[PDB]
Amino acid sequence: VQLVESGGGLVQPGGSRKLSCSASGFAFSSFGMHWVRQAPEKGLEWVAYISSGSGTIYYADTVKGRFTISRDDPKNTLFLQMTSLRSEDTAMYYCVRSIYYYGSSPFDFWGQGTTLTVSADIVMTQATSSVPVTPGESVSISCRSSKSLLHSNGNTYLYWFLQRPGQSPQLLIYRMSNLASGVPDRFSGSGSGTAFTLTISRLEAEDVGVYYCMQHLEYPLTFGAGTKLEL
Amino acid sequence: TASIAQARKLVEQLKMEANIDRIKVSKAAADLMAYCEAHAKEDPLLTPVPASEN
Amino acid sequence: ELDQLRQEAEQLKNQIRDARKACADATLSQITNNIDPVGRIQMRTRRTLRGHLAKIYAMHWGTDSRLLVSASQDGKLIIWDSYTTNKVHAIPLRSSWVMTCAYAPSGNYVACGGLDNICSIYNLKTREGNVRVSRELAGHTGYLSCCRFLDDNQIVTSSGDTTCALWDIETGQQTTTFTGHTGDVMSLSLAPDTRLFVSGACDASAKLWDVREGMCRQTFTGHESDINAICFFPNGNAFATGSDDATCRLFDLRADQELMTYSHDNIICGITSVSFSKSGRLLLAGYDDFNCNVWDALKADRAGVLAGHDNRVSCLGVTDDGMAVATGSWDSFLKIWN
Amino acid sequence: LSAEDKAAVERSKMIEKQLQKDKQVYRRTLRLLLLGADNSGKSTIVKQMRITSGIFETKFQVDKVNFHMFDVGAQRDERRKWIQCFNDVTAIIFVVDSSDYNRLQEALNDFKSIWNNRWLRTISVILFLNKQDLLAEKVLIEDYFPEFARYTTPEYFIRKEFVDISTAHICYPHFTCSVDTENARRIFNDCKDIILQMNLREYNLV
Amino acid sequence: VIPAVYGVIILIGLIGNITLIKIFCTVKSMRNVPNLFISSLALGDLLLLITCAPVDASRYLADRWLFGRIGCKLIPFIQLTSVGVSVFTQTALSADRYKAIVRPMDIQASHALMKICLKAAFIWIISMLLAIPEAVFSDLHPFHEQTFISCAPYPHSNELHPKIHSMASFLVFYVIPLSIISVYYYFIAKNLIQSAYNLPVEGNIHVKKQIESRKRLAKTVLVFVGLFAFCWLPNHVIYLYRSYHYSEVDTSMLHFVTSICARLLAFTNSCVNPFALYLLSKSFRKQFNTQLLCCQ
Amino acid sequence: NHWAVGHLM
Ligand SMILES: CC(C)CCC[C@@H](C)[C@H]1CC[C@H]2[C@@H]3CC=C4C[C@@H](O)CC[C@]4(C)[C@H]3CC[C@]12C
Ligand SMILES: CC(C)CCC[C@@H](C)[C@H]1CC[C@H]2[C@@H]3CC=C4C[C@@H](O)CC[C@]4(C)[C@H]3CC[C@]12C
Ligand SMILES: CC(C)CCC[C@@H](C)[C@H]1CC[C@H]2[C@@H]3CC=C4C[C@@H](O)CC[C@]4(C)[C@H]3CC[C@]12C
């Protein structure tokens, strides 16, 4: 409910920091925390993934070896340490709760985060990036992926997000066929194991924004480019 | 005054039960047979489907 | 004065019995004699659920055949997936002795109770993620025998004080209290039409109550022992009930008379749970003789014996999709058969 | 094997570990039942030896052993249906007021009905005759039980009657009161001898 | 006569072990933690009998060893293993009794199905590792009587190696396990005598029968440990005598009869273990008689 | 003789 992040600022290249995300309002030991890096005018980037109980931890292959994530159940606080800050690590960090079960809500709430300045792979390339449409009509964004993320279980692993300017991203659909909580029923997801379509019938001045997406088939999570609405 | 009230509510319940107009048991048996035969192929327990169609 | 009312009520009961006996023109054995049998349904153990630590008491299925809720005598309401054996939630109950548990059709709330005289309804879609106490229905004067979810906000609940009450999840008060029985209530069963339900008592009695009206319309007393199991037929015009004398009987609310009797001289162990299939052809009953025996709803013949357990069978439940049957006994094993 | 399925399997393993940790404490403790009529002295027992709600639980640790006693205080007097929920328990403790000769017959009747129960054929029952000082002050019985006029102490009438009605699992007739302080140690020794006999009959060492 | 009673006791032990194994395997209900030690003891006794009776018969009756060079490698080794296991199992069994009688409630744990299996596996591994040197140093070398060749675990390289090996065997197979078993059984008997007093025996016939059964159990455990000692002392002392005199050959009639008596006493140990639960307590004679009466 | 030499069992 309340995820207060701290540890930001301007750091010289090659230093070290300890990002701390204090959570309050839910069971921190049950939810699996994740990190997302958002560079200026760029999409998201998965870094780390830890489940409940600190059994197995996964790191991104692009930043493997430098990042170390650790949770504390008595204090219910997440910490992330990083060394050898390069010219690409400068981005806004988002620390995110997620629970995994049958019909779960992974990446439900996104923390406010804090800015930080320094000095097969699922390449989900969207079909159309910028679709400038005035609010009040019905639209449908279409995207595709390089690999069919439809497992034999029958659950299309696809997480639709929406990040309005100023506020953290918000989850929209669970598995392309089950809507989230606290969201309007206008958004709907459909498509096949390769192509995906997000259709909304009634556009308002509040639901406008960038519609991000990601895959959850394999272990390395790769945030797609998303529906980047330029111009 | 509790026993008389209990007898009164009991006889009222019996009268309300007798107020219903029952039907023949053969019609109910035929209806149950037709309902069991209608959803026969739809019930996997009655007709074990292969593991591919599970 | 009371003797006159008593003898008049006895005469009315005798007249009702004579009317129910005279309307019977042909038994079901003569009608279901020229029908094809079912053979032998030899089920096997598909999944093995050994997550509990104590004796399992009751269980219930929902709309989706994936999730399954189970209660034990320790106080750990375990909801787990029937497909990949994954444990979804483990609710630590305030008490240990549990006698019943239910699962809402929407999957948003679950119920549990027992000798505590308090029904603790929890939530599953809580934004906090963990399971928090949502409603504490209190006011009963007897042990909770069986409870089910009639709707996402209103549900009926029986108790050991021979009375049943319709509670609201949001309100939490008795909006409709049914007339007391002459024996302790043991089990109930909701109809698919959600308009009425049936409930069995301890003094060989079965009453059919309604949701709106708190008056019972159908009364059945054709037994010789305490009723311990009762299930409703998916068609909505019949229901089966079992007692401790190992004699199951199928009654019909339209005819108000016995339709089929399932019993054998070789088995003298009563049943504790009964349930029909998705269509109603086979009737699965949980016998206490370290196994179970399934019957045919039309021919009243033993269609198979499931001997995969080694303790007293506590409960048995068939899913709505008719793809799996979960049988829980006192050996902490909730075995799934197909 | 997707990532979500593996995370669900890990969560299930953690839940199983938690259930095992809970079962450890569950088996470390001893679950006991408490029975008695309205005139019984179970209230004094649960008030002194402590070392709507239809069922009350008393958890107490003594001699590095934990005992959880469950008693019925707001339920019906019938013990036919809900009695099966207390199967395979450690032991049952029945309370009886020996000073009340009028309700002594009903006490013996319900004790015989509980002892001859089908679901309690392998559960030990310990009888506690409360109000010992009151009984001693009262005796210092033939109209209710004429056998006392012919029975003599061995070279004890209530204990003999309880033994006869039980042996007609082994009973443990004892005498308690409202001022007794060593009753906890007696219950501990009884529940230890019961566990020892259960271990002997399980290991085939009887 | 000696061969008649020998065959009789061998067949009795064999059928007892077979019945115990069949009860533990086919019933599929009494496979809990306490019965695992009994099953292990039955399997060890069965293996000991099936590996010692034909070998002893071919050594004493037949004047020629039917097995070749490798016959003195795999055949005797496992023998000792089984023996070890058996002894160890009994010790373990005694320990299990020390867990079931001395501490009835202070050992009420939960994770016990895997701990007992791990303990049995450790026992088997330790027995195999202790018996491996027997097969390692087993070879065929002549003996000057006037000279004969047969299986022998002790070579003629030096006189210190067979002596120290026999001493280590007598220490790790007779002294320590029998001492531990005797101490445990004495403690168990003391605890039983102590607990047979505070039991409220005033007028209860069931309590009197329970006290009589407790005294019977104590006396039976005493008789069991006494018979174990009285049967394992002659075999071990004869082994020590024939190991200290390994430099020469002694085949007198007295040595023959005392070796036969020691062999029979050692075999009666494994032949009396499966009948212990039968002759001791109830609730087991019924199944033990039904497993043999169903075929009758 | 051939016997009286070997192991304990
Ligand atoms: C527990 C028993 C059954 C097996 C353990 C093996 C021990 C006891 C035996 C096996 C081999 C034996 C050794 C074989 C050869 C060595 C070197 C020699 O110059 C003197 C004897 C000596 C030192 C023996 C000592 C005991 C010995 C180590
Ligand atoms: C109650 C339980 C946990 C106590 C531990 C078991 C005890 C009694 C048993 C288990 C293993 C057994 C040991 C197994 C092997 C060792 C080394 C061997 O060269 C001689 C016997 C000896 C020394 C045994 C002694 C008794 C023993 C230790
Ligand atoms: C210290 C002693 C007396 C304690 C008692 C142990 C007894 C049981 C054991 C220990 C040593 C063992 C002896 C070791 C060697 C001697 C001499 C040898 O040529 C024959 C066997 C013989 C005679 C053994 C007899 C039994 C024995 C004496």
Spell out the SS3 assignment of chain C: CHHHHHHHHHHHHHHHHHHHHHCCCCCHHHHCCCCCCCCCCCCCEEEEECCCCCCEEEEECCCCCCEEEEEECCCEEEEEECCCCCEEEEEECCCCCEEEEEECCCCCEEEEEECCCEEEEEECCCCCCCCCEEEEEECCCCCCCCECCCCCCEEEEECCCCCEEEEECCCCCEEEECCCCCCCCCEEEECCCCCEEEEECCCCCEEEEECCCCCCCEEECCCCCCEEEEEECCCCCEEEEEECCCCEEEEECCCCCEEEEECCCCCCCCEEEEEECCCCCEEEEEECCCCEEEEECCCCCEEEEECCCCCCEEEEEECCCCCCEEEEECCCCEEEEC
- Strand C133-138: give its sheet, edge to edge: C98-103, C109-114, C118-123, C133-138
H/E/C letters for each residue in D163-194? HHHHCCCCCEEEECCCCCCCHHHHHHHHHHHH
Nearest in space to A17 (alpha carbons), one of A113, A96, A85: A85
Instruction: Determine the Cα–Cα distance for residues C153 and C159; give it in Å rounded to an integer.
Output: 19
Nearest in space to A191 (alpha carbons), one of A170, A160, A161: A160
- Strand A77-83: give its sheet, edge to edge: A2-6, A16-24, A77-83, A67-72
- Are the beta carbons of C55 and C72 closer than 8 angstroms? yes
Judged by 3 or more CB pairs under 8 A, whether C touches A is yes
Give the mutation target among E240, E245, E258, E259 for probing the ligand 3 site: most ligand atoms within 8 A of CB.
Answer: E240
Half-sphere exposure of E283 (CA within 13 A, CB side): 10
Of B15, B42, B43, nearest to C12 by CB-CB distance is B15
Chain F residues close to E48, C-beta within 8 Å: 9
Supply angle C-alpha A40, A46, A52, rounded to 5. Answer: 140
C-alpha distances in angstroms, E197 versus C43, D126, D127, E194, E201? 54, 18, 19, 6, 8
Distance E160 CA to ligand 1 centre (A): 9
What is the phi/psi pair of residue E18, to 5°? -65, -45
Instruction: Give strand pairing partners of A210.
Output: A163
C-alpha distances in angstroms, E96 versus A231, B48, D95, E36, E228? 80, 49, 36, 10, 18
Supply angle C-alpha C248, C249, C255, rounded to 5. Answer: 170
Q: Do C67 and A181 touch (CB under 8 A)?
A: no
Q: Do C128 and A101 touch (CB under 8 A)?
A: no
Of A51, A153, A217, nearest to D7 by CB-CB distance is A51
Which one-letter amino acid corresponds to residue C209? W
**Distant-in-sequence, close-in-space partners of D136: CB < 8 Å, separation ≥ 6:** none
- Cα distance between the two ends of chain C: 60
Residue E202, both tokens = 């005033």
Instruction: Determine the Cα–Cα distance for residues D140 and C223; give it in Å rounded to an integer.
Output: 54
Run of H or E residues at A162: strand A160-162
- Are the beta carbons of A151 and A217 closer than 8 angstroms? yes
- Does residue A102 sit at the D interface (CB-CB below 8 Å)? yes
Half-sphere exposure of B33 (CA within 13 A, CB side): 20
- Are the beta carbons of D172 and D126 closer than 8 angstroms? yes
* Complete DSSP assignment for E140-152: E--EE--EE--EE
Instruction: Determine the Cα–Cα distance for residues E171 and D155; give it in Å rounded to an integer.
Output: 55
Instruction: Determine the Cα–Cα distance for residues C124 and A105; give it in Å rounded to an integer.
Output: 12
Of D18, D54, D57, nearest to C117 by CB-CB distance is D54
What is the phi/psi pair of residue D24, to 5°? -55, -55
Domain count for chain E, please give it.
1
C-alpha distances in angstroms, B19 versus C216, C218, E32? 12, 11, 60
C-alpha distances in angstroms, A176 versus A154, A160, C125, D121? 11, 8, 19, 58
User: Taking the domain A2-118, which CATH number applies?
Assistant: 2.60.40.10
Run of H or E residues at D19: helix D3-28
- Are the beta carbons of D106 and D49 closer than 8 angstroms? no
What is the phi/psi pair of residue C23, to 5°? -70, -10
Domain count for chain D, please give it.
1
Domain region containing D140 = 32-202
- Are the beta carbons of A221 and A46 closer than 8 angstroms? yes
Residue A137, both tokens = 């009509």
Distance E137 CA to ligand 1 centre (A): 9
What is the phi/psi pair of residue E162, to 5°? -60, -35
Instruction: Determine the Cα–Cα distance for residues A44 and A215; give it in Å rounded to an integer.
Output: 12
Q: Do E282 and D206 touch (CB under 8 A)?
A: yes
Residues of E with CB under 8 A from a CB of F: 48, 52, 56, 59-60, 63-65, 76, 79-80, 83, 134, 143, 145, 148, 150-153, 169, 235-236, 238-239, 242, 249-251, 255-256, 259, 263, 266
Run of H or E residues at E160: helix E160-170
Q: Kindly report the length of chain D.
A: 206
Q: Do B26 and C13 touch (CB under 8 A)?
A: no
Q: What is the DSSP letter of A83?
A: E
* Complete DSSP assignment for D74-132: SS-S--SSGGGGGTT-SEEEEEEETT-SSTHHHHHHHHHHHHT-GGGTT-EEEEEEE-H
Looking from the CA of residue E240, the nearest atom of ligand 3 is: 21
H/E/C letters for each residue in D67-87? EEEEEECCCCCCCCCHHHHHC
Residue C39: how many CB atoms within 10 A of its CB? 9
* A216 to chain D, closest Cα gap in Å: 7
Chain A residues close to D10, C-beta within 8 Å: 51-53, 55-56
Distance E16 CA to ligand 2 centre (A): 26
- Are the beta carbons of D24 and E110 closer than 8 angstroms? yes
Place of tokens 């029909």: C276
* In-domain check, residue D10: no
**Distant-in-sequence, close-in-space partners of C104: CB < 8 Å, separation ≥ 6:** C62, C110, C149, C152
Task: Give all chains having 3 or more CB-to-CB distances under 8 Å with chain F.
Answer: E
Instruction: Determine the Cα–Cα distance for residues D95 and D32; give it in Å rounded to an integer.
Output: 13
CATH number at residue D135: 3.40.50.300
Domain count for chain C, please give it.
1
Domain region containing E138 = 1-296
CATH number at residue C279: 2.130.10.10
* In-domain check, residue D58: yes
User: Taking the domain B4-54, which CATH number applies?
Assistant: 4.10.260.10
**What method was applied to determine this entry?**
cryo-EM
**Distant-in-sequence, close-in-space partners of B1: CB < 8 Å, separation ≥ 6:** none
Domain region containing C264 = 1-337
* F5 to chain E, closest Cα gap in Å: 7
CB pairs under 8 A between A and C: 27
* C131 to chain B, closest Cα gap in Å: 32
Instruction: Give strand pairing partners of C164.
Output: C158
Q: Do D2 and A151 touch (CB under 8 A)?
A: yes
* DSSP-derived 3-state class of residue A3: strand
Instruction: Determine the Cα–Cα distance for residues C196 and C192; give it in Å rounded to an integer.
Output: 9
- Does residue D202 sit at the A interface (CB-CB below 8 Å)? no
* C184 to chain B, closest Cα gap in Å: 18
Q: What is the DSSP letter of A156?
A: B
